[PDB]
Amino acid sequence: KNPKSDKFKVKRFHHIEFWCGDATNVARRFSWGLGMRFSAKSDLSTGNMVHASYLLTSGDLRFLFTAPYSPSLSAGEIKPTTTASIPSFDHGSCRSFFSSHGLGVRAVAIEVEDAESAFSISVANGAIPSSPPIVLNEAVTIAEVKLYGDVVLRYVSYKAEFLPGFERVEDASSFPLDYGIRRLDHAVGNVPELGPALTYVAGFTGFHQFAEFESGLNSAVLASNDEMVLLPINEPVHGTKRKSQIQTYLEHNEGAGLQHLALMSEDIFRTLREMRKRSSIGGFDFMPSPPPTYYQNLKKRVGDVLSDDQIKECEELGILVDRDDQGTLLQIFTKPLGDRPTIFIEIIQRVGCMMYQSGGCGGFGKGNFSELFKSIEEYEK
Amino acid sequence: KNPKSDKFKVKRFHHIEFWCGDATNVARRFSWGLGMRFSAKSDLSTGNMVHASYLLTSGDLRFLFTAPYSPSLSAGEIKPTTTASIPSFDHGSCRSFFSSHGLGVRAVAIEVEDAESAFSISVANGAIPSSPPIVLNEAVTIAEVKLYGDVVLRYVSYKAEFLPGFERVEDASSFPLDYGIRRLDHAVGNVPELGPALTYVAGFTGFHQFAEFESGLNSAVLASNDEMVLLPINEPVHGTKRKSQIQTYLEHNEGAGLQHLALMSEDIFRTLREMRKRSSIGGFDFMPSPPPTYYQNLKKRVGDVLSDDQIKECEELGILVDRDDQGTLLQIFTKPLGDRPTIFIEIIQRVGCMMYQSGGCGGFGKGNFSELFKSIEEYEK
Numbered sequence: 226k227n228p229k230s231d232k233f234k235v236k237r238f239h240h241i242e243f244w245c246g247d248a249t250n251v252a253r254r255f256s257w258g259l260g261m262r263f264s265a266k267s268d269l270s271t272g273n274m275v276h277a278s279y280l281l282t283s284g285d286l287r288f289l290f291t292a293p294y295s296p297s298l299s300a301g302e303i304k305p306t307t308t309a310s311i312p313s314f315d316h317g318s319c320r321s322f323f324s325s326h327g328l329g330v331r332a333v334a335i336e337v338e339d340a341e342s343a344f345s346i347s348v349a350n351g352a353i354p355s356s357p358p359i360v361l362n363e364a365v366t367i368a369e370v371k372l373y374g375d376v377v378l379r380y381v382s383y384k385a386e387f388l389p390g391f392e393r394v395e396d397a398s399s400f401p402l403d404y405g406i407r408r409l410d411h412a413v414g415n416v417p418e419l420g421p422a423l424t425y426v427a428g429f430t431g432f433h434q435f436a437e438f439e440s441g442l443n444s445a446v447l448a449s450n451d452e453m454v455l456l457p458i459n460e461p462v463h464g465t466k467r468k469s470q471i472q473t474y475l476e477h478n479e480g481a482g483l484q485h486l487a488l489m490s491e492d493i494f495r496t497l498r499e500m501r502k503r504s505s506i507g508g509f510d511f512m513p514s515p516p517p518t519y520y521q522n523l524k525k526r527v528g529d530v531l532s533d534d535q536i537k538e539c540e541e542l543g544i545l546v547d548r549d550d551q552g553t554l555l556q557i558f559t560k561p562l563g564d565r566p567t568i569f570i571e572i573i574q575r576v577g578c579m580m581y582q583s584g585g586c587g588g589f590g591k592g593n594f595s596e597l598f599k600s601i602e603e604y605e606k
Numbered sequence: 607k608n609p610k611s612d613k614f615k616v617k618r619f620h621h622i623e624f625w626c627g628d629a630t631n632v633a634r635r636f637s638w639g640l641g642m643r644f645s646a647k648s649d650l651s652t653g654n655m656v657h658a659s660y661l662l663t664s665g666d667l668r669f670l671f672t673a674p675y676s677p678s679l680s681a682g683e684i685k686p687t688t689t690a691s692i693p694s695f696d697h698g699s700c701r702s703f704f705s706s707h708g709l710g711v712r713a714v715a716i717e718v719e720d721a722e723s724a725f726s727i728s729v730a731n732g733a734i735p736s737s738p739p740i741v742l743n744e745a746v747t748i749a750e751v752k753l754y755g756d757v758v759l760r761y762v763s764y765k766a767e768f769l770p771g772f773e774r775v776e777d778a779s780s781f782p783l784d785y786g787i788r789r790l791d792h793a794v795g796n797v798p799e800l801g802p803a804l805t806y807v808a809g810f811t812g813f814h815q816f817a818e819f820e821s822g823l824n825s826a827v828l829a830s831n832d833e834m835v836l837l838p839i840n841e842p843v844h845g846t847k848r849k850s851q852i853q854t855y856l857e858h859n860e861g862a863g864l865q866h867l868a869l870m871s872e873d874i875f876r877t878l879r880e881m882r883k884r885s886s887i888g889g890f891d892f893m894p895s896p897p898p899t900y901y902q903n904l905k906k907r908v909g910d911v912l913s914d915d916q917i918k919e920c921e922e923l924g925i926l927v928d929r930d931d932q933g934t935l936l937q938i939f940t941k942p943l944g945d946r947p948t949i950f951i952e953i954i955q956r957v958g959c960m961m962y963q964s965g966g967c968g969g970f971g972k973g974n975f976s977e978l979f980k981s982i983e984e985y986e987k
């Protein structure tokens with residue numbers, strides 16, 4: 226069921242912001258690794274004495290990378306006189322985030338009809354405020370509330386190009402890479418206790434539990450009215466033979482934070498071919514492929530959705546497949562994006578549920594846990 | 607003249623270590639940008655709970671990238687029980703370095719006959735000690751003294767693979783990139799006062815002033831006995847019409863530090879072709895090309911060293927050329943490697959002074975200051 230209880234008008238995922246120590250190197254590695262173009266900048270060359278911020282785009286997917294300059298550059302400024310293009314930025318908060326968590330996501334940004342109302346209603350409804358609504362050049366309004374750990378849910382709204390004060394990146398610098406990635410499908414947090422995290426977040430958003438379908442985790446998914454903003458949350462299961470990777474996340478991240486970003490591709494086979502070509506030359510590595518038993522059992526499961534050629538192409542690329550009662554899902558996971566075993570990326574493509582495609586079509590790969598266990602067990606013999 | 611006054615036996619540049627917030631992303635960007643192979647690692651996968659360190663190699667050039675993990679991972683260790691492969695590493699020192707300087711060089715490492723003696727004689731001769739000599743697995747000895755700002759001169763010596771505790775990187779991960787870079791030619795520091803910096807460093811090394819040949823800087827070059835270890839130092843000139851870029855460095859870096867690394871290529875034309883192909887797809891950008899007047903005046907200067915074809919190839923790639931009384935030098939400079947206008951890279955190739963090639967053959971490009979001024983002046987009209 227879908228009660229459509231959003232307490233304010235939510236549109237779509239707008240951008241994801243990584244807090245970094247050096248934004249240039251992370252941005253350039255991600256661009257090559259994922260096929261995302263440099264499309265806007267806010268830094269010293271644009272008058273910003275506070276932070277360096279570089280935006281990568283692919284389709285509607287926006288990855289923002291931000292790092293602080295030396296505070297001495299802006300020591301004479303005050304908030305009314307700031308040159309920061311993102312007024313919520315804070316040198317100390319940023320350095321503290323990165324030294325506590327390493328490279329990771331600071332802001333999950335969703336676009337809303339009215340960022341001030343969304344902020345006001347949110348905190349009226351239990352949200353811990355993080356940065357009050359601020360109106361940028363009479364054009365854009367931005368506001369932030371705590372989501373979990375040191376991650377904020379950021380609201381953005383436009384009266385009528387990324388943000389004021391950002392400049393388009395010169396086209397000679399902007400090389401039009403594209404490996405097929407098109408938008409953010411879901412952004413997933415890890416926490417020590419699912420219950421209170423769910424209660425808090427659904428409490429101030431009105432997001433409902435997305436209706437779905439013993440190793441690892443327990444999860445639940447929060448979704449907006451049209452279920453295009455999807456915010457799953459995991460917690461660890463303690464005691465198992467294999468140590469919970471959610472617990473490993475919490476230890477290495479120093480607590481709760483964003484675990485994985487799932488990026489929708491319009492052609493997962495082209496995306497995975499292009500990213501795998503670059504794994505060893507600056508891009509991203511992928512988790513170990515499932516054993517061939519897994520693909521031998523795929524025909525009995527999605528033989529009506531994927532031809533024998535498409536299923537063997539899954540085998541080369543290491544793609545996983547799962548299926549709801551309404552759609553089929555193709556998915557694969559990268560290795561951690563940085564030094565720590567914390568944040569990683571998921572590539573997905575959804576087939577089915579056309580009316581546009583409805584959100585979550587196929588679920589999130591729930592069936593692939595038992596299928597992978599049964600496959601390792603079958604293959605071993 | 608060359609007094610050969612080294613106070614201890616110095617061999618060659620051994621490696622350069624960057625202190626980072628995330629070593630994975632910097633390392634992967636540098637590898638693609640410069641054509642350096644992943645050759646060794648020390649991290650969680652090798653038992654190191656303290657720091658992540660990744661080594662890139664090209665020829666004899668070794669670039670080490672290191673970042674701290676969460677201190678909680680090693681909270682039960684003490685120095686005798688440490689899992690750090692580089693015993694001089696310190697979480698607080700590293701986080702402080704990166705938050706004060708951003709991405710940059712922490713250690714210039716030279717190999718010496720005996721690292722304990724080199725340390726002892728150095729501090730006996732005025733060197734501020736930074737990390738005392740430590741013997742790694744009865745095989746390698748490492749010691750560190752302050753060089754300038756927060757940069758250390760690191761001594762390494764072997765009784766008889768990078769360091770103990772590092773593992774060779776699996777060849778599937780190791781893609782054999784190579785754009786022709788072969789070794790470190792010189793490593794250059796920026797300081798506010800040349801005099802005391804020279805006095806201190808030459809004081810404890812015995813390095814002599816390398817004998818050489820109004821906009822910017824004043825410099826001098828320190829060299830070892832055979833002049834293969836070259837450590838130039840700059841200071842700003844205040845008052846000029848154009849603000850000294852040494853002063854800009856000092857302000858943005860929060861003080862003294864390593865300004866540029868000069869990497870020797872065995873074929874600067876192949877190197878610059880390969881790096882320029884990648885500038886906009888994750889690699890490095892280059893400083894703006896000199897005006898064509900500069901290349902029109904090149905025939906009158908190195909017409910006997912470079913054919914008309916080689917000089918026009920310089921024009922495409924933006925290469926600078928200079929000439930001593932013994933050799934010719936080809937050089938070009940990258941844009942800053944990271945967010946701040948601080949550290950950058952120089953690519954060079956030296957032609958002449960064969961007996962092997964003697965160090966510094968051609969100088970360091972002194973003549974290119976007046977030649978560039980005269981070129982901008984000539985071209986303008």
Ligand SMILES: Cn1nnnc1NC(=O)c1ccc(C(F)(F)F)cc1S(C)(=O)=O
Nearest residue numbers: 411413444457545589590591593594597
């Ligand atoms: C619940 N949820 N919400 N958003 N995403 C998710 N689940 C996943 O994406 C997911 C799906 C399948 C697997 C499996 F079985 F292949 F290992 C692992 C994950 S995993 C550990 O979490 O990455």
Ligand SMILES: Cn1nnnc1NC(=O)c1ccc(C(F)(F)F)cc1S(C)(=O)=O
Nearest residue numbers: 792794825838926970971972974975978
């Ligand atoms: C003295 N020294 N020691 N080691 N390296 C050096 N000099 C250089 O490499 C050098 C050489 C020529 C130019 C010029 F004229 F093209 F701008 C700029 C530099 S620069 C600012 O310093 O990068």
Ligand SMILES: [Co+2]
Nearest residue numbers: 413487571589
């Ligand atoms: Co997922």
Ligand SMILES: [Co+2]
Nearest residue numbers: 794868952970
């Ligand atoms: Co130089």
